[PDB]
Design a binder for this molecule. Structure first.
Ligand SMILES: [K+]
Ligand SMILES: [K+]
Ligand code: NI
Ligand code: NI
Lengths: 146, 154
């Protein structure tokens, strides 16, 4: 389960994809729990990028896929609850909670995230997740930045 | 007391759609937010809280939320005690369903240390009747703290 924060909009539509791009992203999200870089990479354009901002950016489609793969080595998504999704000028935004589990220790933690996606022809030409890395490491005892 | 350590210039990221347009206010609420951003460099909580509704909240997600206008101002004012906005740059602004989104860079100075850092922020704003009923900034707190030696957590 994921209880929904008091501050989450009570507009019934703020959770639902409103546009094509948004449907995609929501699906991509749904596909994240596959924990499969090779599968996930599909949503991406050739000319793309990716970054969990506390960590370094990955440019180009195969870097992106490779970063994904390496992450999936120590951790796995158990759940993605997306509270708000919105869009303007070709970028899509998601406020969600990712339930991530750390493979080495088995502990999981509910990470508060706000991501931006850049799409071009339904192709993810960009993906950037903003969150606090430290409280995650501390929770599941899995360091990722020295 | 330490001298003021060298502000770092704001870089246009490889991914920041030049374009912009994409960084311009396309809607009324957006123009409001863009204006609120402008106000932040005033480092004046009194100026800022007048953008808020009574039913409102404020949270830097690595830090505790403030609910209610009264708690919001205490938070804002408290931050301005140890910290100061030198600049804010918004690459991407957008909006749907009553929420505005800003992908921006915050240039902050730690008052006690004189040191400066550029925080990569993605923040979301909820508005109502033209007033901020919610404000949440997402970023990594540790990389900021270490950069300028201002531990804030707890
Ligand atoms: K929506
Ligand atoms: K815009
Ligand atoms: Ni000292
Ligand atoms: Ni000094």
């Amino acid at each position: 389960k994921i209880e929904q924060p008091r501050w989450a909009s009570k507009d019934s539509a703020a959770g639902a994809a409103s546009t094509p791009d948004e449907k995609i992203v929501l699906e991509f999200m749904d596909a994240l729990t596959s924990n499969d870089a090779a599968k996930l990479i599909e949503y991406f354009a050739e000319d793309t990028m990716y970054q969990n901002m506390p960590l370094p950016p990955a440019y180009g489609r195969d870097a992106v896929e490779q970063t994904l793969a390496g992450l999936f080595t120590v951790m796995s998504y158990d759940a993605v609850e997306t509270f708000h999704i919105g869009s303007s000028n070709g970028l899509v935004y998601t406020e969600r909670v990712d339930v991530l589990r750390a493979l080495p220790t088995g502990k999981s933690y509910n990470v508060s995230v706000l991501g931006v996606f850049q799409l071009t022809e339904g192709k993810i030409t960009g993906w950037r997740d903003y969150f606090d890395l430290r409280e995650f490491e501390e929770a599941v005892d899995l360091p990722l930045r020295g």
